[PDB]
From a paper:
The SARS-CoV-2 Main protease (Mpro) or 3C-like protease (3CLpro) is a dimeric cysteine protease responsible for the cleavage of the viral polyproteins 1a and 1ab in 11 sites, including its own N and C terminal. Mpro substrate recognition has unique features and is specific for Gln residue at P1, hydrophobic residues at P2, and small side chains such as Ser and Ala at P1’. The absence of similar sites in human proteases together with the importance of the enzyme for the viral replication makes Mpro a primary target for antiviral discovery and development. Herein, we evaluated the effect of single mutations in the active site of Mpro from circulating polymorphisms on the kinetics and inhibitory constants of nirmatrelvir and ensitrelvir.
For nirmatrelvir complexes, we determined the crystals structures of the WT enzyme, as well as M49I, N142S, G143S, Q189K, A193T, and A193S mutants at 2.1, 1.9, 1.8, 1.6, 2.4, 2.5, and 1.9-Å resolution, respectively. The structure of the Q189K mutant in complex with nirmatrelvir showed that the replacement of Q189 with lysine resulted in the disruption of a salt bridge between the NE2 of glutamine and the O atom from the carbonyl group of nirmatrelvir, dislocating the ligand position compared with the WT crystal structure and causing the loss of a productive hydrogen contact between the pyrrolidone moiety and the O from amino acid F140 in S1. Another potentially impactful resistance mechanism depicted here was the one caused by the Q189K mutant, in which the crystal structure revealed that the absence of a productive bond between the oxygen atom of the amide group of nirmatrelvir and the side chain of Q189 caused a rearrangement of the inhibitor’s binding mode, leading to an increase of 16-fold in the Ki value. Nirmatrelvir retained its potency against most polymorphisms tested, while mutants G143S and Q189K were associated with diminished inhibition constants. Another key difference between ensitrelvir and nirmatrelvir resistance profiles is that the former seems to retain near full activity against the Q189K mutant. Only G143S, Q189K, and A193V mutants exhibited significantly decreased enzymatic efficiency against the fluorogenic substrate, which might hamper these polymorphisms’ capacity of being selected without any compensatory mutation.
Author numbering:
A (entry chain A): 1 to 302
B (entry chain B): 1 to 305
């Protein structure tokens, strides 16, 4: 029993974290085979943070301007290219700790683990979800940049996120490992703010199913709802609209518990109507939205 | 900025997890140098768990009774010994990934990282506190036994916990790596219950300090209390007493925020009496007590390797 916000073992990613330095800028790099991936804004001074021309700044750089350090070893840089907002440094050594990996772009709602690093040393690991507004509610200080988000599937590491910047509201923005930003952000210091956040409705229902399987039944009820009446009510609490696709994904938890998704939707509407009246679900007095249907099955049946 | 329940990187510890099988029981082992550590109750059958005679059950067992598997490779057991509630199996091979490590035993309120494992394969890492009643609120299914708790200080892994059992209340109990239980528990299937839990007061106050640092400041009030007067409120609300010791630990956070510890106590007191009056603190409707002062500093400022 028990239910924990639980990250993947960070071991396979720890073996890939290096320090990338350029001028007075030091941030973190991901060393896979003979390529170090890191945020391109490493090549910006304080000045060129406002309207950087990355193409112009990079053409000024030779291989020898990039100090790559893996623990003690300085890697020798033998090539640099840019792909979108990530800089790719070719090094003369393939990383011997390179795991089986892929690059994946995730959708809002998806969870992944973040290995927070400073100076190419891993600090800590925590579990994140991609918010509907394409930000993550992370924990990152100065020099954290180039810290990555990942999933692990059997022995394969799925890299989905590289950290770039903090927005004024304290939420974080970054790119996939092809360097395309999640959402409408750019690696410039400009007036840009996170859109209005919403609750990830599909995740809350999943978490309620976890509550049932872990033997908590105090919040259900005898009502059901139409998908439309559910969405019309939920949306007034800033909940993401639930789609037929979301219901389909809840098939397995519905079947395992024998509570139809629209029945559990009825429970949710009433929980929003009523709150907790003291009580808790799975040790929380808020409705948890950073557990996907997959995360529940893995932790409560695996 | 931001504040998360954050675990230590598990790499050094993932390199030490093995599978131990004795008869039809499989669980997890910790492989360090040429010894494998795992719960002694691996030797117990369903029958033997009700009234086990460990010294007797153990002496009836030869090394050939113990399958130790590191991935696909069999390790050869060349010796076996018991220390308190942990079985120590000498294996023919030293673990080449053995980190700098020591065994430490923690007090309630201290936090640590748990690496949950099944069949010697690490599944997940989460952050835990040793509860005041010496349980931990874990997430552990069948085969999780031999999952370890640790902290890291630079390159030294300090192992502090090995998982043994689930209490009927759904909370978890285990030992230090010398096999001494945390709390008044025994490794038999017999009926056991967690005593009544209390809230780790110093940790809430540390967490409230973490709130102030992230600009969540609404709960500050003008009032200050005294330790004596506060601790009377604490007891009523099933809160651990705040000691002179506890107050001194918070000096860094008091100094960093300019909020006196007994001032922060007044905010806390008022919160217990009044509730949160709608609001949340760092996105929680509950007062959080599983972040230590050291945990808060290692994330909100640095010292984070
Ligand atoms: C990488 N080391 C930091 C990560 C930041 C620092 C504080 N916590 C973090 O997660 N990244 C940066 O310094 C990026 C970098 C320029 C400015 N910047 C920011 O994080 C800033 N953000 C913005 O100005 C905003 F909102 F517009 F994006 C700041 C708020 C000053 C921390 C670039 C290229 C975005
Ligand atoms: C190790 N593989 C399991 C892990 C358990 C399984 C359910 N959740 C967990 O964390 N631990 C055990 O097999 C221990 C072990 C015998 C029985 N046991 C229990 O978990 C039982 N608990 C107790 O006996 C209790 F409550 F009294 F502490 C169970 C009835 C399954 C809850 C021994 C030696 C205690």
């Amino acid at each position: 029993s028990g239910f924990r916000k639980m990250a993947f073992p960070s071991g396979k990613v720890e073996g890939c974290m290096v320090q990338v330095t350029c001028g007075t800028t030091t941030l973190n790099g991901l060393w896979l085979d003979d390529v170090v991936y890191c945020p391109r804004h490493v090549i910006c001074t304080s000045e060129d943070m406002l309207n950087p021309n990355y193409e112009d700044l990079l053409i000024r750089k030779s291989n020898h301007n990039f100090l790559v350090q893996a623990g003690n070893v300085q890697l020798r840089v033998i090539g640099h290219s840019m792909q979108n907002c990530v800089l790719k440094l070719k090094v003369d050594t393939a990383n011997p700790k390179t795991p089986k990996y892929k690059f994946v772009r995730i959708q809002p709602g998806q969870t992944f683990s973040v290995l927070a690093c400073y100076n190419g040393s891993p600090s800590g690991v925590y579990q994140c979800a991609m918010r509907p507004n394409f930000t993550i509610k992370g924990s990152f200080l100065n020099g954290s940049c180039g810290s990555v988000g990942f999933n692990i599937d059997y022995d394969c590491v799925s890299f989905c996120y590289m950290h770039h910047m903090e927005l004024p509201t304290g939420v974080h923005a970054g790119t996939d490992l092809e360097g395309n930003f999640y959402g409408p952000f750019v690696d410039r210091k400009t007036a840009q703010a996170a859109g209005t956040d919403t609750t990830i409705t599909v995740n809350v229902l999943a978490w309620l199913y976890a509550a049932v399987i872990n033997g908590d039944r105090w919040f259900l009820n005898r009502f059901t709802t139409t998908l439309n009446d559910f969405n019309l009510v939920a949306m007034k609490y800033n909940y993401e609209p639930l789609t037929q696709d979301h219901v389909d994904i809840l098939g397995p938890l519905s079947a395992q518990t024998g509570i139809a998704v629209l029945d559990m939707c009825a429970s949710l509407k009433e929980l929003l109507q009523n709150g907790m009246n003291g009580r808790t679900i799975l040790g929380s007095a808020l409705l948890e939205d950073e557990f996907t249907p997959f995360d529940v099955v893995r932790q409560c049946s695996g």
